[PDB]
């Protein structure tokens, strides 16, 4: 095992002031770590914990390469679409996982941070797009959607709509419409020299 000893951030990802909106999600690279996954085992009553290819009880017993953790926020009972191999409104235009995955899908139902009580218009998501996305692709352009054969000069009119739309989270809608901070974490097994390893002598 390598002789590195410094801890690396699993506290600047799960404990963050503001997650990125789903249409433009934020990706972080984790490397050169003595990585222990026991810190996130409790972390409030997880609404979802599925790792798709490795038992979560044995994660600090393996050495990975180029771990990538990326996070965003979801409307509510919609994190069902983050599983691989299924389609939907948000798995087609916002974020799509491949058919083969090797990562966990932690999500933990924050409502005391992402719900103002007033008007919350800083969490957007794409609604209109010509074609479906591609696995692990980010679309960031804000251009006027054109659902027709007539060119658009840059203003909203007939079949000349706008793609982005706000969520407007409220502390009243219950559980179906209630913000969900989501973090997915993909890692590739040993093919190259290892950089991230668990704690072992």
């Amino acid at each position, epitope marked *: 095992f390598p002789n590195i000893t410094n801890l690396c951030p699993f506290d600047e990802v799960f404990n963050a002031t503001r997650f990125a909106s789903v249409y433009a999600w934020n990706r972080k690279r984790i490397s050169n770590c003595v990585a222990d996954y026991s810190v996130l085992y409790n972390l409030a009553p997880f609404f979802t914990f599925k790792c798709y290819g490795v038992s979560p009880t044995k994660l600090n017993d393996l050495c990975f390469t180029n771990v990538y953790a990326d996070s965003f926020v979801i409307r509510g009972d919609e994190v069902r679409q983050i599983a691989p191999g299924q389609t939907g409104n948000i798995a087609d235009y916002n974020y799509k996982l491949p058919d083969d995955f090797t990562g966990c899908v932690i999500a933990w139902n924050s409502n005391k941070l992402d719900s103002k009580v007033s008007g919350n218009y800083n969490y957007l998501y794409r609604l209109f797009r010509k074609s479906n996305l591609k696995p692990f692709e980010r679309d960031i352009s804000t251009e006027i959607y054109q*659902a*027709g*054969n007539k060119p658009c000069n840059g203003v909203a*009119g*007939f*079949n000349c*709509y*706008f793609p982005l739309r706000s969520y407007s989270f409220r502390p009243t809608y219950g559980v179906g419409h209630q913000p969900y901070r989501v973090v997915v974490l993909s890692f590739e097994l040993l093919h190259a020299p290892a950089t991230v390893c668990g704690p072992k002598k």
Partner: antibody
Amino acid sequence: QMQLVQSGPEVKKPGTSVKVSCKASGFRFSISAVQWVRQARGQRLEWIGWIVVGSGDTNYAQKFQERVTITRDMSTSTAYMELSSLRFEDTAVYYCAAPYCGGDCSDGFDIWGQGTMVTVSS
Amino acid sequence: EIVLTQSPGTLSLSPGERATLSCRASQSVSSSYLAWYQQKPGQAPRLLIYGASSRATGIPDRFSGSGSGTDFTLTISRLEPEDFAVYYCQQYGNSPWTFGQGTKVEI
């Protein structure tokens, strides 16, 4: 594409409110936009307002600004228009129009409903 | 508000002749947003020409349509005995979207 199915005739009294439903089937309703039109007996057509199905944004005329409300239901695939504070001049036939929009919209309202008659009597 | 004046008020052509209609506009409107509808007595209107130049699907080549800017015209080559209805013109470029007066074609 099939002409949008519209509700049946209504007879109301002045003061109350009425609701008209427009059900769409046979084409991709998730991109199209629905406009509402009123016509009296043997008179010119009048414009009420239009709504985007996906976004839900509405637009009305300066006369119907504070009397009509247009909403839609995606799961049922319907468009509803509620008109309140009926008067003697509100008795007419209402039409529902949308473009036949599959993979690409038709650039014109070529699908029209059969029309619903509302009579404000006493 | 955009105001559309449709002329002439009434047409009295025998069948088999040439028919012309005009939909003059108060202000300039994009040629990409203008439609001509036909209205039979006691029936819903139907779309004939959209975009001021392109016919709708399943429409005979008799109806042509032309014009741009502030002058739009509709032309019918031969009057079938079923082409006697009320013709409206509607612009949907900028809100509000306003119809026309209507032109009646008789025998």
